[PDB]
Design a protein around this ligand. Sequence first.
Ligand SMILES: CCCCCCCCCCCCCCCCCC(=O)OC[C@H](COP(=O)([O-])OCC(O)COP(=O)([O-])OC[C@@H](COC(=O)CCCCCCCCCCCCCCCCC)OC(=O)CCCCCCCCCCCCCCCCC)OC(=O)CCCCCCCCCCCCCCCCC
Ligand SMILES: CCCCCCCCCCCCCCCCC[C@@H](O)O[C@H](CO[C@H](O)CCCCCCCCCCCCCCC)COP(=O)(O)OCC[N+](C)(C)C
Ligand SMILES: CCCCCCCC/C=C\CCCCCCCC(=O)O[C@H](COC(=O)CCCCCCC/C=C/CCCCCCCC)COP(=O)(O)OCCN
Ligand SMILES: CCCCCCCCCCCCCCCCCC(=O)OC[C@H](COP(=O)(O)OCCN)OC(=O)CCCCCCCCCCCCCCCCC
Ligand SMILES: Nc1ncnc2c1ncn2[C@@H]1O[C@H](COP(=O)(O)OP(=O)(O)O)[C@@H](O)[C@H]1O
Lengths: 459, 121, 98, 49, 347, 320
Amino acid sequence: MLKIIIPTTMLLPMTWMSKHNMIWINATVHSLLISLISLSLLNQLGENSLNFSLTFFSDSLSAPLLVLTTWLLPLMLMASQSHLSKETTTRKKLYITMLILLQLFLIMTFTATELILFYILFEATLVPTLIIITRWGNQTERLNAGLYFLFYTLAGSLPLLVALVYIQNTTGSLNFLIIHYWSHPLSNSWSNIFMWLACIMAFMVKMPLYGLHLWLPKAHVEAPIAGSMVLAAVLLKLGGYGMMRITTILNPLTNYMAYPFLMLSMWGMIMTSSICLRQTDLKSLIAYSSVSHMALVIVAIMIQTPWSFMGATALMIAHGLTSSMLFCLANTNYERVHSRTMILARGLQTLLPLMATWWLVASLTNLALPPSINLIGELFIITASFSWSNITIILMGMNMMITALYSLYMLITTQRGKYTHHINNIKPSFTRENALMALHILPLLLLTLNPKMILGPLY
Amino acid sequence: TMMSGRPGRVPLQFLPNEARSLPPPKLTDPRLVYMGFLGYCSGLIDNAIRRRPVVSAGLHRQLLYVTSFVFFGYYLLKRQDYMYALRDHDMFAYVKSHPEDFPEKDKKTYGEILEEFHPVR
Amino acid sequence: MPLVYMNIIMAFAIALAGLLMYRSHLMSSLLCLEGMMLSLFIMSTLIILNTHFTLANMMPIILLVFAACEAALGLSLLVMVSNTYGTDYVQNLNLLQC
Amino acid sequence: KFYIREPPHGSPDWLKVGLTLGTSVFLWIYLIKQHKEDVLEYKRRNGLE
Amino acid sequence: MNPIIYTTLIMTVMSGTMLVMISSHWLLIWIGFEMNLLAMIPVLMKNFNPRATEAATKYFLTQATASMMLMMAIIINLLYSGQWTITKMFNPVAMTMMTMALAMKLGLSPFHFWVPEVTQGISLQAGLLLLTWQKLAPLSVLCQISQSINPNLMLTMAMLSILIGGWGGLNQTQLRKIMAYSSIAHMGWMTAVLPYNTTMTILNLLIYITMTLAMFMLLIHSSATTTLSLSHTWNKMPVITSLMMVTLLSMGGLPPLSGFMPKWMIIQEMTKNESIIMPTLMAMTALLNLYFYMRLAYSSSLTMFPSTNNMKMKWQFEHTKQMKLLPTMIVLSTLVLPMTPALSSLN
Amino acid sequence: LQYGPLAFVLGERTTRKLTETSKVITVDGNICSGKGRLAREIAEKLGLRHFPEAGIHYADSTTGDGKPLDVQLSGNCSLEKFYDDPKSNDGNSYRLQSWLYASRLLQYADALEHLLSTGQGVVLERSIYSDFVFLEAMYRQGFIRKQCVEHYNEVKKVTACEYLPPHVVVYVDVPVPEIQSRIQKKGNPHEMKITAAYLQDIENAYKKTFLPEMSEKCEVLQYSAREAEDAEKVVEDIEYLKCDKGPWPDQDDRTFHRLRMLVQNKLEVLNYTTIPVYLPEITIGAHQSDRVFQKFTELPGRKYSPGYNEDVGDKWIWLK
Ligand SMILES: CCCCCCCCCCCCCCCCCC(=O)OC[C@H](COP(=O)([O-])OCC(O)COP(=O)([O-])OC[C@@H](COC(=O)CCCCCCCCCCCCCCCCC)OC(=O)CCCCCCCCCCCCCCCCC)OC(=O)CCCCCCCCCCCCCCCCC
Ligand SMILES: CCCCCCCCCCCCCCCCC[C@@H](O)O[C@H](CO[C@H](O)CCCCCCCCCCCCCCC)COP(=O)(O)OCC[N+](C)(C)C
Ligand SMILES: CCCCCCCC/C=C\CCCCCCCC(=O)O[C@H](COC(=O)CCCCCCC/C=C/CCCCCCCC)COP(=O)(O)OCCN
Ligand SMILES: CCCCCCCCCCCCCCCCCC(=O)OC[C@H](COP(=O)(O)OCCN)OC(=O)CCCCCCCCCCCCCCCCC
Ligand SMILES: Nc1ncnc2c1ncn2[C@@H]1O[C@H](COP(=O)(O)OP(=O)(O)O)[C@@H](O)[C@H]1O
């Protein structure tokens, strides 16, 4: 993994040593090169993982997440250079430094082979994100959003640290391979119940579980565009990766403890879709859609079958790409009219046709349209839930109907109708924005062409 | 205090004579490189606080920072390695001396061990 | 333990409870502080003289010396407080809050 | 002469520069010698070379 | 105060602490405490004003009471054993008196009020010396006598310290009182781990001292004593605000900064001894400290507060005095997490 | 080494340095008097150093190059605009008054540092203690507000409480009609816009507050226009003021050490001139503050410390 880790730590000095007008060019080009290099991790095995060294290893679950992280960095650079034109050179370099640090922490998080090093990195991702939000956000509420995000995550994750050190004392090791090979059943006792709670609650807060989700609209609405892109596409997936990894040691207690979380996930999936139906803000609509999809992923992990894990992996990758694209589209609209209200700017199809096409494609992927990987993951989760019980189909069908309703509602409201008459500053779409949307959407369809690359280790 | 008061401990001795029988750290140790990195960061912060050009000014001062950090890190690594070797030595000796407390257990295969099966469905 | 030790320890406890319960004057609390060290002196010398710990006979003298240093320090602080506020009342030491 | 008033650090303090460089060089050569002696003593005590 | 008299008083404070640390006799330990207090009072009163006089008076009263209780404990121990050496104490009552006296010296709750009051009373340099050195000595005594410490009393006072520090810091808006309540909380952590691993106590002491030195020296450099005074520093020297923000993040215990190492090691060590409820409560309560550190970080670096018109003249001028080892303290307090296993060298 | 505690321990003593002619002399008077000429003559005849009146851009003259900076970057206030529109709606009057007070404070610190490091006396054309007369004139004419006066008083307290008052205060008394005549003859339109009630308020403040207050500290010499014209008799009167009832005789070596440590540090001198009192006149928004600070950084010899500015011809930076 060092062939990918070191070039990022070299992005840092290159960013600080490049000229004042070449920072964006250098950062974008070399981020793309590092993404290309990280594409080599997809050549996985059918039996075991890629054990690079004592510290880092890669799997069919880690590799797509690393590729998504490395691919997301240059897109964030493009959106950032859109909205950070008037900044000073030092502050531009500080923003790029925060993005690079976040990418480095995420890479080491997905490739860390110990639960304690994984904990350290997955908690280290909080600082750059908090700085980005509370420093380069636009509105007053960025401070409160940062407080909510930070304290929700830490309240979730501190009992996880206690549980991890306890498990290390009990079993002698926190290495994932050793805890997989030496796993023992978790007896039904109050102590085991609270160990299970510590671990799962950390990752449920990070996911987020319905009822532990308010920090998500607060932070995703109030963050800058790069912050929104990384919060939804990658940072939400630390919870899924952690829950998939740590449930090795939590059986058979997961069979009995998953009822409250499954009930919360299914009902809150319905509730957040219904909220999306009646949102006066576009960014909040996209955030609540993210909550619904992560609820589906939580259901998949909790029911915990080989078909549900594949659907969970596929849905995580697909949601990352789709939500990042939706945030970028909303941000272009905001940079036009300087407001997040959904009904302020209308007729954007007759003012900007190609952006209307991008909106159509992003909203067609947001709802599960076959054969997109969004649908593939959702359908695998639905099938596993059907095997779990036969009323999960009722809840899942209701969720799919509401998802289609609010996605097409967003499309029709923003793009169709008649343009607002007094908004006379809708300049033609930039090549940069068009290329950003294309770079979001083409990999999704190529992943549809080759779907075994994102179905996880259980494939 | 676990190892404080261990027999034969000379007070106020950073590195005893018995530490000379251990392999000294390689000068290219990653921990030594990280100590040098800490020295370099201190030098840059010094330039920034004093409002000199961060990367250019005070090259002699930055060299002194890095050299001091590498020096102290080398000796610190030697002491750390010595203490860990001492801990392992004591633990092994105690296990050897207390066989009734650390007994060897007969190994049973998984064909003989019976484990409850918990289906996932 | 003889009843003499009980009485000396009781005197120390009384002088400690006197110090911890201010009334108005700082001087009265200083006098309570000086009583505690007197009881400590008496207790130490009773313990040492009974056991014939010959080399420990000098300890009560050092105890007295540092009692004097504490009393001097307290009187200096008292004169400064009185210069500032006109009285040695402890109610005037309320500028700083917790 | 840009400054109306002579800056305190207008000219390099050659005494301090020489002391800095000398201290750095002394520390480096001392570290190299100490490492060589440590390797030799370790090998001699363990009977390796 | 004459510079020679000031440096001889500083040396006398240090000599008293060193006598406490190197003595093997309870009388000599008491003498060291007395010498430290006697030379420490004028240092607090160095800049004469009613607040400094009041702070010195309160500090003297508290420390004199603690020394008296300590000598009573020493004499009671001598009565029941005839031993002057500092080892495990042979009487539970003497041990309880000693624990109370040392806790009163350190400022552990419920003996904490003097800490914020005195720290707000005295200047920034005096507060720096107070917190650092005057925590350095009693903790060494406690580490020496740790094997007889009552775990219940020690852990009760530690949890009280953590809770009180968090809540007081939440309310405060003055920088010195914020520092004092942070100090109370950190002392709580150290003494919580004390009955299990004095090595972890020493590690927490060193990390706390480094972070406190960096923070106090940044405040001295920026000449800021309130929140709104510190809100003007972004318009004079924006580097100092950024370093202070990183140091505040480190103090709050966020990974991968150096403030995470003591909390991590203490949680692990207490878990080895089958303590779970105590480490979990301690870890959750530190979120209060993190909250008011983050509140301080919003005002100074992450947001730009209004400035004044004379800041232009301040721009024209330059800072003269150079803080000693400020860059080193900044780096050690933020970037030494990958160097954690050196605590064995500390052992 | 520069002066510090080590120099004090080694033996540098201000009392030993002084030569008994180390006197601080301040000349005062109403607007457009002969105080500048009298001060120059006093400094020349007595061998003292002259300090012209500290207006705007004094701090510019003492730092970097002597050339004044842009008004947007140094002062953000205008004397000509104060004359043109005294009752402005942007707080120009009190911005000007506070900036001029800070400049006078900085100049007094400069003069004290010179006297303590050299032993040569100084002659200031106006001091900290005479600065408030314009504040009272502005307040009584309705130019500034009671809040502005209160902020001024707070800053003046916490700042001027720390220094040594002048040895000699020389006041030149000129009647208001003569002041107006001289102003008209000078021909500058902005000062020709000065009203007579403003000039009377300054004189009332001088005669009723400043002169009675400085009489307690030391001796005050008052002259008319004719007496101020003949500076030889003024210098003769100064040379035979053998009495000194001020704090200067009470000053000792340690007090002088503290004072010199204070006055050699210009950021500590101006520490309380920027207190977070949010008057609308002096408060500057975050965005304007950021923009102006960036511009000042972009100035030629201002980005780095004085010895480290390569664009103004500083070499050996890598070994400095
Ligand atoms: C090596 C590259 C960096 C990597 C970093 C990785 C971690 C390292 C930590 C320590 C780094 C060393 C210390 C640097 C201090 C710099 C201070 C400074 O003045 O920076 C600006 C300075 C240039 O600006 P300037 O002319 O001084 O003007 C400054 C004015 O303020 C300009 O006026 P203005 O008003 O426009 O500026 C205002 C600005 C001025 O503010 C600053 O410049 C302050 C910058 C941050 C303070 C230092 C924090 C140190 C503590 C550790 C964490 C650092 C992470 C970020 C590092 C930033 C590095 C600049 O403040 C703000 O805008 C406020 C923003 C507040 C939020 C952001 C600040 C906090 C960020 C850090 C917290 C997050 C940590 C997360 C946890 C993980 C940590 C790893 O930047 C540099 O000099 C760049 C330094 C690096 C140069 C390259 C060195 C390597 C050369 C090539 C090596 C090749 C090796 C061999 C390869 C093989 C082939 C040959
Ligand atoms: C010029 C080159 C650079 C020099 C820079 C010097 C800066 C450091 C100064 C040196 C400090 C150590 C002094 C070395 C000589 C003293 C020898 C003696 O003190 O060493 C031992 C003790 O030394 C110290 O205890 C350990 C020194 C190591 C401390 C530094 C590392 C702390 C760990 C931090 C880990 C993360 C940060 C990594 C470093 C960046 C003696 O043991 P003992 O007398 O019986 O202790 C009795 C009390 N006990 C038992 C309870 C402990
Ligand atoms: C930097 C100075 C030296 C530093 C020493 C190194 C650190 C060690 C800690 C301090 C130890 C100091 C040594 C003093 C202890 C002497 C004890 C002793 O040995 O007894 C006398 C020592 O002999 C003397 O007379 C020494 C007299 C010294 C007087 C002058 C000492 C100077 C003190 C300066 C005061 C500084 C204040 C210190 C700060 C407070 C203390 C922390 C010998 O008695 P004998 O009869 O020969 O015993 C054998 C029986 N047949
Ligand atoms: C054993 C004592 C260790 C500490 C001594 C600290 C002394 C200096 C304190 C002031 C702050 C740092 C220096 C900043 C620059 C000061 C102004 C200047 O220009 O200094 C020039 C000086 C040149 O070095 P020079 O004095 O010649 O070296 C000693 C020669 N006998 O430049 C320098 O000296 C710069 C380099 C200073 C050394 C690096 C910083 C300390 C390194 C410690 C290594 C161990 C890590 C842990 C440290 C824990 C805290 C001590
Ligand atoms: N504090 C102040 N507030 C407003 N204006 C001031 C202040 N101090 C000086 N001035 C102005 O500066 C100018 C200085 O003129 P002055 O030096 O008194 O004339 P002369 O040199 O003839 O004595 C005057 O026009 C006066 O109005």
